[PDB]
């Protein structure tokens, strides 16, 4: 009787696919995909409101106490623990100008900024609060040189010679 | 005082994270004209739940604020609820809608 009319369509589709696959040889820039390979990257990718509430509480504590370097350090830690480091660097630069003569805030601002900015931050912290052993140690640690660290150690010995 | 109900004591640690745990549910309410004060003491966990935003605490405080007026007699209830917290006054005014007889007026003076 009436045979499977879909057989002709299947044969035509197979012929078209074979012709396309053969023509694919001439495609020099032919490229493929790896969903199965990506599957390993998706399985390896496995690691909100409370973090936003903590960030809002840190912002309210910084607005209620601008001269609190524990509040500025907590705001910098909350901004650097999640999201981007630019907001943490801006908060550290705001806390260094709002609460001067603080060793912990200057240490957090030196740890949050890059070294080209950390050198200027350590220079500003030495100009605002000199004879600091932690600021001098952070400046000698962010020098990446022998002569620069020797000059920083000589400046720390000339400023505060009673530091072990 | 809306902040008193939402006030959370924060721990201090050099390396450990600060424990900004809630203190209590009392709003430090006062009424000098009434010759007394109101202490709406609530559990700290009840005052501020886990991952509870400030807006969520304000919404829950409004329900408790209306509850205190509901428990009190209409005559004994404050005829004018003068709260300096203008932002929190509107939910209190919205809560005050449950009591049409009572009125809510902004408090320029802050206790």
């Amino acid at each position: 009787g009436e045979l499977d009319m879909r057989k002709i369509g299947q044969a035509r589709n197979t012929l078209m696919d074979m012709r396309l696959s053969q023509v694919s040889d001439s495609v020099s820039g032919q490229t493929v995909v790896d969903p199965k390979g990506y599957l390993t990257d998706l399985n390896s990718m496995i690691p909100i409101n409370d973090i936003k509430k903590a960030r809002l509480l840190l912002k309210s504590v910084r607005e209620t106490n601008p001269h609190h370097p524990p509040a500025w350090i907590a705001s910098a830690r909350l901004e650097e623990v999640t999201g981007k480091l630019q907001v943490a660097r801006n908060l550290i630069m705001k806390g260094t100008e709002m609460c001067p003569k603080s060793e912990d805030v200057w240490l957090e601002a030196a740890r949050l900024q890059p070294g080209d900015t950390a050198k200027a931050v350590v220079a500003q912290a030495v100009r605002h609060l000199p004879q600091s052993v932690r600021i001098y140690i952070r400046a000698a640690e962010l020098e990446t040189d022998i002569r620069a660290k020797k000059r920083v150690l000589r400046k720390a010995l000339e400023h505060v010679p009673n530091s072990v | 005082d809306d902040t008193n109900v939402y006030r959370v004591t924060i721990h201090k640690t050099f390396e450990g994270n600060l424990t900004t745990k809630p203190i209590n549910g009392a709003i430090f309410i006062f009424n000098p004209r009434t010759g007394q004060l109101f202490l709406k003491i609530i559990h700290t966990s009840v005052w501020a739940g886990q991952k509870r935003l400030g807006q969520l605490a304000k919404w829950k405080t409004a329900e408790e604020v209306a509850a205190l007026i509901r428990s009190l007699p209409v005559e004994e209830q404050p005829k004018q609820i003068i709260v300096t917290r203008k932002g929190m006054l509107d939910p209190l005014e919205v809560h005050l809608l449950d009591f049409p007889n009572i009125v809510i007026k902004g408090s320029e003076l802050q206790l």
Binding site: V61 | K12, T20, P22
Partner: peptide, 29 residues
């Protein structure tokens, strides 16, 4: 983060979000 319960100020919803530049500067990143 002092031991005072009020040490951390209450976080009231604000900084109204909006395609409006409050700072009034045309951003160019």
């Amino acid at each position: 983060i002092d031991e005072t319960y009020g040490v951390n100020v209450q976080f009231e919803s604000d900084e109204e979000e909006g395609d409006e530049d409050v700072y009034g500067e045309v951003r160019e990143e």
